[PDB]
Paper text:
However, recent high throughput sequencing analyses identified a high incidence of somatic mutations of critical histone lysines into methionine (K-to-M) in multiple cancers. Other histone K-to-M mutations also dominantly block the methylation of their corresponding lysine residues, suggesting a similar mechanism of function. Moreover, we determined a high-resolution crystal structure of H3K9M in complex with an H3K9 methyltransferase G9a and SAM, which provides a detailed mechanism for the role of methionine in trapping histone methyltransferases. Nonetheless G9a is inhibited by H3K9M in vitro and its SET domain is highly conserved with that of Clr4.
To understand the molecular details for the interactions between H3K9M and its methyltransferases, we determined a 1.7 Å resolution crystal structure of G9a SET domain in complex with an H3K9M peptide (ARTKQTARMSTGGKA) and SAM. Clear electron density was observed for residues 3–12 of the peptide based on the crystallographic analysis. Compared with the structure of another H3K9 methyltransferase G9a-like protein 1 (GLP1) in complex with a dimethylated H3K9 peptide and SAH, the binding mode of the H3K9M peptide to G9a is essentially identical. The methionine residue of H3K9M occupies the same binding pocket as the dimethylated lysine residue. Five aromatic residues, Tyr1067, Tyr1087, Phe1152, Tyr1154 and Phe1158 surround the methionine side chain. While the dimethylated Lys side chain assumes a fully extended conformation, there is a sharp bend at the sulfur atom of methionine, such that its end methyl group is in closer contact with Tyr1067 and the sulfur is in closer contact with Phe1152 and Tyr1154. The methionine side chain does not extend as deeply into the pocket, and the SAM compound at the bottom of the pocket moves closer to the side chain, by ~0.8 Å compared to the position of SAH in GLP1. SAM does not make direct contributions to the interactions with the methionine side chain, suggesting that its role is to stabilize the structure of the protein. Interestingly, the methyl group of SAM is 3.4 Å away from the side chain of Tyr1154, which is part of the conformational change to stabilize the peptide-binding pocket. In addition, the position of SAM is incompatible with dimethylated lysine within G9a, suggesting that the binding of SAM helps release the wild type histone H3 tail after methylation reactions.
Numbering used by the authors:
A (entry chain A): 920 to 1090, 1095 to 1187
B (entry chain P): 3 to 11
């Protein structure tokens, strides 16, 4: 039964309810829910509209004429806004969406991430991994899920943050820390058999220091399944010295046994 | 090698 009807308090296109079937812990409130990245010191993002590369398309940007598709290598979105099956889910390309300088309309085919959350998610209490996020609907492969949103900080600032549970490297490298300011993505756990992947995306600016992180499903996800991505070795090289992976996959790379084995 | 854990693409 529902504890919070929407932890995003109306900030997303859809609500994100919270439940806890495990204990009496309230839904987390030790952070500020924000729907777009914030700054707590000057970031100097290049917002100059004349610095944008942009297309001159007169259609829905599904043709070879689209510069933005070419910047992305090709436009990877199909007619339904899902990544093409051909999309490299292992080493994802940079995506350049259309922007305010393009001649196309706001409803062209190359604007998926900038249109926000469309799928139904739930914040819930897991057995062994704290809070997590799961699907309340079927999510076909290649579907945009949500953005990793948080506080933009420098690499140097990131290295002195006390809590390093929510740091996402963007690459003079910058980092998103979702510890104090974050969205639903801050609750997505690590899975060694993941069903979503993060992808670097450019939308309203093309300052390469500041890609935005978009999660897409990498396979069909069924109702009730926990969402998770592979946090990567720059996370686990450090974290594996303090706790072990509880994802429970027979392919788990960071389990107690896997860690003991490598240390031996 | 950094001081803190970082998730990454
Ligand atoms: C980005 S937060 C995910 C949300 C978190 N579970 C919470 O309750 O706030 C990452 C933290 O969740 C926990 N976690 C995520 N995936 C895990 C896993 N596979 N095994 C053990 N702990 C995990 C670890 O504490 C990790 O530092
Ligand atoms: Zn175009
Ligand atoms: Zn364009
Ligand atoms: Zn366009
Ligand atoms: Zn694992």
């Amino acid at each position: 039964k529902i504890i919070c009807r929407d932890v995003a308090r109306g900030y997303e296109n859809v609500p994100i309810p919270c439940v806890n079937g495990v204990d009496g812990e309230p839904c987390p409130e030790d952070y500020k829910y924000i729907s777009e990245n914030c700054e707590t010191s000057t970031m100097n993002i290049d917002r100059n509209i004349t610095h944008l590369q942009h297309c001159t398309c007169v259609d829905d940007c599904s043709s070879s004429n689209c510069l933005c598709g070419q910047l992305s290598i090709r436009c990877w979105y199909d007619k339904d806004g899902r990544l093409l099956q051909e999309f490299n889910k292992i080493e994802p390309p940079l995506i350049f969406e259309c922007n305010q300088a393009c001649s196309c309309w706001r409803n062209c085919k190359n604007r998926v991430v900038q249109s926000g959350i469309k799928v139904r998610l739930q914040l819930y209490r897991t057995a062994k991994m704290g809070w997590g996020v799961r699907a309340l609907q079927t999510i076909p492969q290649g579907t945009f899920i949500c953005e990793y949103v948080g506080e933009l900080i420098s690499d140097a600032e990131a290295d002195v943050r006390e809590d390093d549970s929510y740091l996402f490297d963007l690459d003079e490298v910058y980092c998103i820390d979702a510890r104090y300011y974050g969205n639903i993505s801050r609750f997505i756990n690590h899975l060694c058999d993941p069903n979503i992947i993060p992808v670097r995306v450019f939308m309203l600016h093309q300052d390469l220091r500041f890609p935005r992180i978009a999660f897409f499903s990498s396979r069909d996800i069924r109702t009730g399944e926990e969402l998770g991505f592979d946090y990567g070795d720059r996370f686990w090289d450090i974290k594996s010295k303090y706790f072990t992976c509880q994802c429970g996959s027979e392919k788990c790379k960071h389990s107690a046994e896997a860690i003991a084995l490598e240390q031996s | 090698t950094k001081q803190t854990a970082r998730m990454s693409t």
